[PDB]
Structure formats: C-alpha cells, structure tokens
Nucleic acid binder design. Sequence first.
RNA 1: CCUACUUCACAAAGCGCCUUCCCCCGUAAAUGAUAUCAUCUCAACUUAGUAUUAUACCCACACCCACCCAAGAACAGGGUU
Lengths: 31, 94, 82, 157, 38, 177, 50, 174, 156
Amino acid sequence: HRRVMHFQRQKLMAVTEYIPPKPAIHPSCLP
Amino acid sequence: MTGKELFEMWKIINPMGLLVEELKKRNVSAPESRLTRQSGGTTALPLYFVGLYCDKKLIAEGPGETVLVAEEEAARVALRKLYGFTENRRPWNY
Amino acid sequence: TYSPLPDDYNCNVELALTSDGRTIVCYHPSVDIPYEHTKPIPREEGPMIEQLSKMFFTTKHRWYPHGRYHRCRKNLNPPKDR
Amino acid sequence: FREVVETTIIEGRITATPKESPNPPNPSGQCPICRWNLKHKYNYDDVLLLSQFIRPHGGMLPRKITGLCQEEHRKIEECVKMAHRAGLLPNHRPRLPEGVVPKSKPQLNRYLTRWAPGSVKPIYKKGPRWNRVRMPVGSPLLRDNVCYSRTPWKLYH
Amino acid sequence: FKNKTVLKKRCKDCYLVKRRGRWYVYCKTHPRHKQRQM
Amino acid sequence: SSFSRAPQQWATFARIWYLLDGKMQPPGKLAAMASIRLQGLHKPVYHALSDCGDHVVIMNTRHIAFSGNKWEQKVYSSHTGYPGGFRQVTAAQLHLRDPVAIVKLAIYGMLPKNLHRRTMMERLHLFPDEYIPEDILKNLVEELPQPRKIPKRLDEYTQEEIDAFPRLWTPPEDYRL
Amino acid sequence: QEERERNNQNPWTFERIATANMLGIRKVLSPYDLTHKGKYWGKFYMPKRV
Amino acid sequence: HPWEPGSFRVGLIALKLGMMPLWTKDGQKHVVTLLQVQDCHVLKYTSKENCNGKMATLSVGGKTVSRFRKATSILEFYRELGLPPKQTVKIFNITDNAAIKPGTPLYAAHFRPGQYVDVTAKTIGKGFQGVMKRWGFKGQPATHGQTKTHRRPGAVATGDIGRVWPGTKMPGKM
Amino acid sequence: GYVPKTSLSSPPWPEVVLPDPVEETRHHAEVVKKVNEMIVTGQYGRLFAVVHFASRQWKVTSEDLILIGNELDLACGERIRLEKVLLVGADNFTLLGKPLLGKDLVRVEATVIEKTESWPRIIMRFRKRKNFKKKRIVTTPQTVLRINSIEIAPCL
RNA sequence: CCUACUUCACAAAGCGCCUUCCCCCGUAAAUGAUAUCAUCUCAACUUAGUAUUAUACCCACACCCACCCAAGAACAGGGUU
Ligand SMILES: [Mg+2]
Ligand SMILES: [Mg+2]
Ligand SMILES: [Mg+2]
Ligand SMILES: [Mg+2]
Ligand SMILES: [Zn+2]
C-alpha cells in the first residue's frame, strides 16, 4: 500500500519506465 | 409537371395490357414474369421484386407487398422506360 | 485481373484518372439480374392484442389505445415534403 | 521407434523411425522450430506442428528427445493442452482399459482453455470496475506471438 | 490437512502436487505432514 | 428508381430475414452481429424512430462455444423478488437447463436500453438445433458468415496437407514412444 | 542499476523531464523529486526505476 | 394394456360426504373421510403432442348439474358426448397405455384397500383474516399498556430497505 | 526465409496484386475516352453535383432549392454560377475532382428567388441561485437559391 | 380438518385429529505423460458425482332478473332439474 499519486504524476511514472533492449534474434536461438 | 410521376398525371388501368400491346408494336417477345427477389413470404409484411424478361433479357424490375402488386409495378416501370418518363430522365430545359 | 470490390451485386466500377491527374473518372453501369438467377411465379380485447403482436412481431403495448390528451395533441395536418 | 511385445517372452522391435525434411530454411538453429522459422508463428490451432511432439495417447514427449528450446517446450506443452480441450486431437485419447467404457457426459464446445475445467471455481462475486475478477482466455506464454491486428491479444475477458 | 500460505516438505517422503487448481503436500509416511495451499 | 411512391417506400423500409449458424461460435460474436441487424444499424437509412430493424434467425444455439473457462467461470445471476430468491448458476448449468438462454441474454445485453429493445427481441428467433419451422424457413433471405472460422481437427486434414507440412525433428531409432 | 540506466531504450526519463519542467510537471512534483529522480516516493524506495 | 412399471392411470372426482371412526385389530382408532363417487365419467383424451406437454391427459368430470345453468360452449361439448353436464372437470396426466375412451364411467372400485391416494380440493374459505388467524402471529399482550396493539402485525419489514419484501405475511383472504 | 503453413505463418488478409502501371495507364485512357464519348453523345440523363457554397457541401440537382444562412448581396431573380463543384454524377458515370473539378468541365447555375429573415431564435441563459437570467431574440438573414441547371462539357 | 374429546353447538375453534417427498462437492482412489519410475489431472482422463432435480396443483365459460350458499368487505365465485 502506497499513498495515492496525482494522475499527472502517475502518467509521468508510466511513460518513464525502463524498456530493456530486444535483439533481432534471441541469443539462445543463435549458435 | 416537375416532381411528378407519369402515371400520377396519366391515370391508367391494366398496365400489363398496355405493355404487351406496346411490345408487340415494336415486334419483340411478350414479357415473362419471374420472381427476382423475395423476403418474408409467409409474413404479413412480405417484399417481392418481380422482373419482366423479353427473350431472357431484363426490361423492368418492380417491388410490391404481393406478387400481383409487384407485377403491376414492374409493368409500370417498363412503360416508363419505353416512353422515356424515367425518374432519371434529362430535366426540362428552360 | 484486379478488382477493388467484387462487381457482381450493384454495378461494375471502373476507376480512371484524366491525363493531367486532376480528375478521377468512375464508370458504373448497372448490373442486371440474369434469367437463371430468378424463380418462376407461383399460382375479445386480450386475445386480439396477442394475435396482432404475433402477426407483426411486436410487443402488446403498441396495440393498446391512448387517452384523449394524446389523441387531440397529434397533428392531423402534418407538413409534407416531396 | 521401438515396440515392446509380450507373447512369457518379451521382445523389442524397431519399426520405421520417421526422419526430418531434407533441408531446413535456417540451419544453425538450436530449436527444431527455431530452424523452420516457427518461433512466434504457431497457435493451439496448429495441430500438424503439435502432433509431432506428442505420444500416441496424447502425452507430451520429453525435451531432450525432441531437442526443443525450453521456452518453446513450455509453449508447445500448453498449446497441446488447449488442443486436447478444444477436441482437435480425437485420435490421441487416453488409454482406457477395455472393460472401462466412459459414461455419457454433457458436451460443451470450448477453445483457448488455459485451466483444466474441473479445477476452476465459478466467479460468483465479480469485483467493482476498478478491481474486476476477469476470466482468463489463452495462455500468457503465447503473448510473444506475432500480432497482425493493431490491438494486442486480449488475454483476460 | 492444514492450510498454509507457504508449503514446506517436512520429511523425505513428503511430495508436492497441484490438484484442483491448488498445491498440496501429501505424505503417506507421516499423514500429519499433509498441507493445503490457501 | 422509376418506381411508384408507395412501392419505393415499401422496398426501402422492408424487413429482411437473416440466418446465423451458431455451431462452434462464441455467443458474443453472434450477439454482436444479431444486435447490428436487429437495430437496423446495417441499413444506411437507419434512424432510431424509423423502426427499420430486421429479423434474425439463429440456429445451433446448443452448439455454441466459449473461449477459456467461461463454461465454468461465467455466472448468470437472477433474483426472484422474494427473500432468499437470489440464484446464481454457471453458464454450463444454464445451457443444460435452456439451450437458447446464453445467446438470448448476450443479444439482450448488447441491445440499447430503451423501450424499443423488447420489440427487437420479438424479431429474434432462436432454435437450439438444426431444425427450424417451415414458415420461418420460407422467410429467409441471406445466411450471414460465421464470425469464428472453425479450426480443423487432426483427422479432418487431408493426406496432401499432412505431407505438405514438414517433419521438424528426427526421433532416435531406439525410443519406445 | 548503473547498467540499466545506461542500457535504457526509453527516450524519456523522470530526471530529464523533471529538470527541464517539460510538461509543467514541477506543478505536480516535489522539489525533492529533482534529487530523488523519481526513485523515492515517501519512505518507500523503488529499485526497479531508472 | 397390461400394467407396466412407470405407468400412471387416471383418477376420479368424488364428493366429500363426511367422516366416521374406524378401528383396527391392534386397537388403534383412525378417523376416515367418506368420498362418494357421483356420475364420474371420462370426458376428453389429449395426446402428448397435441397437449404440447410431457404426458397424455384425460379430462374427467364429476357430479351432474343443470343444463340451464351452463354456457352454450360447455352444453355443446356435452351434447357431442351424450352426457349431462358435470360440475367440475379435472385433468389427469397419464401414459399412452392407460388411455380410456371418453364417455366411460368410473367407479370407487377403481381404488383398492391398502392403496395410498392424494386428495386435492379447495380449502374452506375463511374470508379476510388478520395475521393471527392467517399466519399464527403471536400478537401483543392484553394489559400492561398495549394501547391499540393486540392482534396487529408488528414490524412488517426492516428499516434499511425503504420497502416491503414480496411475499411478506400480511392480513388478507385465507 | 521459408515458413511452413500455420495459422500465424501468413497474414490473415488475402494477397493483393495491383496492376502494372503501364497497362493501368493504358486502361485508364480507354475508360476516360468512353466516358468522354458518352458526354459528347448526351447519353447521360439527370445530373447531380456536390457543390461547396457558404462553408457547406450541398448535394444539388436541377430544380432543387437550398437555404443559405446569410445575405448574398444579390437582387432577387439574379442568376449566378456556383463555382467549387467537387463531384458531378450521372446514372452511369461520376467525375470527382482533387479537390475541385475544373471550370471547363462542369457549370452549375442557380438563381436568387427569396431573401428572408429566419423565424425568431431564443437565446436563454440561466444559472440557479445566482439571480442570473438573460433572454435574447435573434433572426438570421437567409437566401433561397433555385439550382437552375447542371451542364457538362467534353473536357477529359 | 371436525368423527370423537374440549371451548361450544345448523357453525367457528384447540387443548383434538390427519399428512409431510431430492442432493450438495471437501476429499478418497485407478490408468497415465511433461519428468519413458512415480504422480487423483489448473494434463488429456476414469469412479464415488446427481445431472437441468422433477413431479404434483391450476387449466372448459350462460343470464350476469332474482334467490340461496360450506363463496364473500364491495366486487367476484359455486348452486338453482
Ligand atoms: Mg396473546
Ligand atoms: Mg385496548
Ligand atoms: Mg392514549
Ligand atoms: Mg354464477
Ligand atoms: Zn512428510
């Protein structure tokens, strides 16, 4: 349980989320 | 005359008779009446489209609540096309 | 060999451009129904509402009368277009 | 493939073991499916693919035997579960004893069924709008599948 | 059975199965070791 | 065109009988289609006050399919006015009791919440199996395409299709299977 | 954590937006948020935030 | 047809004469009701398909009444039968093998001693009754105050609901 | 890059091949020519046009009346040419411009027949408990145009 | 419901007499894969398991003078051969 955020603040949090890099071919699939 | 159907101005009786006379005048086959389209046959509100065919060629198609009324309507459509009183006829030049 | 829409129901649509490319031209002759596609022409208030309801596929409510207030409100000379 | 025969004498006999198609489109692929460029391109529907990795009586084959990628093994496993529940594999029915004849049971057509039908409890009290109990449809394992529609797979209904 | 949020195998003969959509510990040797996921 | 005024009007606002097959189809997708047709939203002459709705006939409502565990999970709730009159049944239970109930309720939900709704429900005709009354059969015009394409079973696949699909892996010779 | 910060594919970070006042966001942010960089919210700390 | 398991036969319409005591060899006294069968005939047969029901039905009538006091429809029906009109007609759900031709008389010997029967009638009408006679409500005490509350229903419903539940026990026709 | 036939191997939508530009250009010429020939001959009957006038698109035909919600500063009986024709249609052909058809191609003529005030329109403002109540009566100037003719010249 | 008993007496009552019908689901087990053993299975599955309970009741309609009633505030209902 956390304190309720302002909607604008919550939107900012959602937009600024870590996106991990995705290679074209999965490394396991590669020899 | 503007915005008026032909048969609204000229009252006719038995349009099928007029049609057969007109077609025999132009030396073509007598029209054949066929059910083109049908909806809710058994219901109190049926729609029927009947078409008139001269040597298996469509001359007119007419809607009605019954087949007989549709036939009359198709005949009137035919007469309009023959005489050139189509809804889409060239408007009067003023 | 290519048609954007199947031309078998309403009309045969042909799209073109004028040489300049300013005007789009559409040719749409009407499609006539073939002979083969056709078919030859063949040769007690309570109970009353129920009969009418079934006949015209409606609810019972339509068939009940309304009072003097609503009857007299209705326009008996409504405007007609066309 | 090996068949065991009991006549008391027990023998093992090798029949025709099917072999892979001559030239895969992507050699140096670790998975069997990775080779045929079938990573995110199969669903529960694809019984031709799925029937290859299952035993005659419907059970899943082990990962080592088939040489499947672990991820892809899990995907095929759940896809085959769904295939069974959708009734797409009629010839892979459980080995019922000859004496045991299955009693008549009410038939309900289903598909994209994640859980076993016996285990799930009814949603008697679905929540408010802001906290709603949703009915799962399809597996989250198939989330990574290629999506031609602009809207992604709606996994919860 | 006893309800447990977290299930622990209490002995060697304990075994962990998912039945009826929830985890269980069963134990033939020690029946007291029986646990149900809550 | 070139019709008389009355037949023109008649053709334009005519009721059309449609057929739907409910075999291996989600109720919601059938309901979606039915709702469109019942309201008359498919017609470009549509208006709320024009009562230009059309008849929809749905067959094989017993043979509907649910995605996921909706047979078990989805619950239909009804209350008889009386104390302790609250009854909750699963979709499976309701289906066994009344085969047409699920499709009926789905369509009813999707219809607009006004006085027109119940009349629209009069135009809806549901039959659990293949059988349809002769009078209703004579009325029909068009059969609407099934919203869900039914996946083929393994046995349904032709030998040509089987051989077309490659073998993806080589099993060991000495394996029991 | 350092690697995640460097590796991040998201063009938009809390730090960048907050410092530049990019949507007039300082209106809904604490002055402390500039230093906290959106990692800290009250007593709670998010380790999963860059 | 011979009797088969699962088969149901037609019943009767009888007139309640009254009651008398009956004794048994064990010495126990049982009160019994006398039911007289008066002009009981089978009136109508309906097949299961025609009835649109689960079972075939026999309409059976009892206790002949005046022709002058009946409606034309009923009179016509009885005229076709060739029987005088009957006071009450009741419907019995039967199997097909238990079908009886209309006009056939029914007798008390249809039932046999040792058999168990169900009896259906309109109960004695007590007219409009209060809660105490209708539902056996305890009522309120006589003295110690109780200004105008002796036989009244107490709290009809709960405060929170701004209404009264359907099927609440209230004064009415019993 | 072969993928065996599965449900998700191929896109659900059917493969569409569009005609080669050379053949299509030729085909376009033939279609334009025959439509031109119809215009020359006068095969067309009644015409309908979609005209842009006073901010609004009007689907008009011969002998059609339109109400314009402004004064046009034209005397009654004055014939005007409506420019800005978007679409001109017959029974068998339609010509539609990008966004406007050329002047040479199509000519639509109308006449001013009536200049009137609109019926009185009430503007009312009310806010409760604020003693806020205003009433205004507005009448808008109006013009009625009779679409006299739509004519097409063989210019394609 | 009124044959007796009791309050009482053309009847209403209890203190009197008569009748009263289905199950519930938590687990306990077979066969058997993932994980060639084993394993009750949010694997396909097999039994206890019953599933949608079902059956009962009701169901024809003069004149609507009047009279009567075991029907009833009025109205309505039953009888008047
Ligand atoms: Mg007392
Ligand atoms: Mg007092
Ligand atoms: Mg006082
Ligand atoms: Mg009477
Ligand atoms: Zn243990």
